[PDB]
């Protein structure tokens, strides 16, 4: 089981914090988005655009599930994997670290540069949709709104200790 499963919206710094946290812990980093491509020989765009979301999510959940069983390090979850009820089910009992930001801060950082003229509106809609799901599955919630990456990581490590 992973030491930490990281979840967050675009703009939360999830990739960056995952790399940093895995380096602080001395553990493997598995990015589920990368694993799908490594396993399918197809890009995310190509799967998502060709097969459609439902099939992408089916593929994702299978990869998420395997990693949850196999990976002992940090697992960085693709941003929409939480939208699948089976992912939310499989997550239960894991350490799930939610890299939490406000929608205003998301928009400030991105936004929604992560669609055409409406992309900001869709990004506002994306986070209204995903953020309650991240809240639901979290076991640790970390306000990354104003912390730097090293501070977020220091905060996480102090709440993931192991006896003695």
85: exposed, middle or buried (Cβ count in 10 Å: 0-12, 13-18, 19+): exposed
* Min CB(44)–ligand SKM separation in Å: 5
In the complex with ligand SKM, the residue whose CB is nearer, 81 or 138, is: 81
Of residues 27, 34, 44, 160, which one binds ligand SKM by CB under 6 A? 44
Whether residue 150 is annotated as binding a ligand: the answer is no
Q: Let me know: does 103 contact 127? Beta carbons within 8 Å.
A: yes
In the complex with ligand SKM, the residue whose CB is nearer, 9 or 156, is: 9
Q: Is 77 helix (H, G, I), strand (E, B) or coil?
A: coil
DSSP state of 28: -
Q: Which residues pair with 96 in a beta bridge?
A: 5
In the complex with ligand SKM, the residue whose CB is nearer, 18 or 78, is: 78
Name residue, tokens 């992408």. 56
Cα 110 from chain centre: 16
In the complex with ligand SKM, the residue whose CB is nearer, 80 or 111, is: 80
Among 21, 31, 63, residue whose Cα is nearest residue 158: 21
Q: Is 145 helix (H, G, I), strand (E, B) or coil?
A: coil
DSSP state of 2: -
* Min CB(154)–ligand SKM separation in Å: 26
One symbol per residue from 59 to 88: x for binding ligand SKM (CB under 6 A), - otherwise; what is it?
Answer: -------------------xxx--------
Q: Binding site for ATP: residue ranges?
A: 11-16, 147
Contact footprint for ligand SKM (CB under 6 A): 33, 44, 78-80
Q: Binding site for substrate: residue ranges?
A: 33, 57, 79, 130
């Amino acid at each position: 089981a992973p030491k930490a499963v990281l979840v967050g919206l675009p703009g939360s710094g999830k990739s960056t914090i995952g790399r940093r946290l895995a380096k602080a812990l001395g553990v493997g980093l598995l990015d589920t988005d990368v694993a799908i491509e490594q396993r399918t020989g197809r890009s995310i765009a190509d799967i998502f655009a060709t097969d459609g979301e439902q099939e992408f999510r089916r593929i994702e959940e299978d990869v998420v599930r395997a990693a949850l069983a196999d990976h002992d390090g940090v697992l960085s979850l693709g941003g929409g994997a939480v939208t699948s009820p089976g992912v939310r089910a499989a997550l239960a009992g894991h350490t799930v670290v939610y890299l939490e930001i406000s929608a205003a801060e998301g928009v400030r950082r991105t936004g929604g540069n992560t669609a055409g003229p409406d992309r900001a509106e869709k990004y506002r809609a994306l986070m209204a949709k995903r953020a309650p799901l991240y809240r639901r599955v979290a076991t640790m919630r970390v306000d990354t709104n104003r912390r730097n990456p090293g501070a977020v990581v220091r905060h996480i490590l102090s709440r993931l200790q192991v006896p003695s």
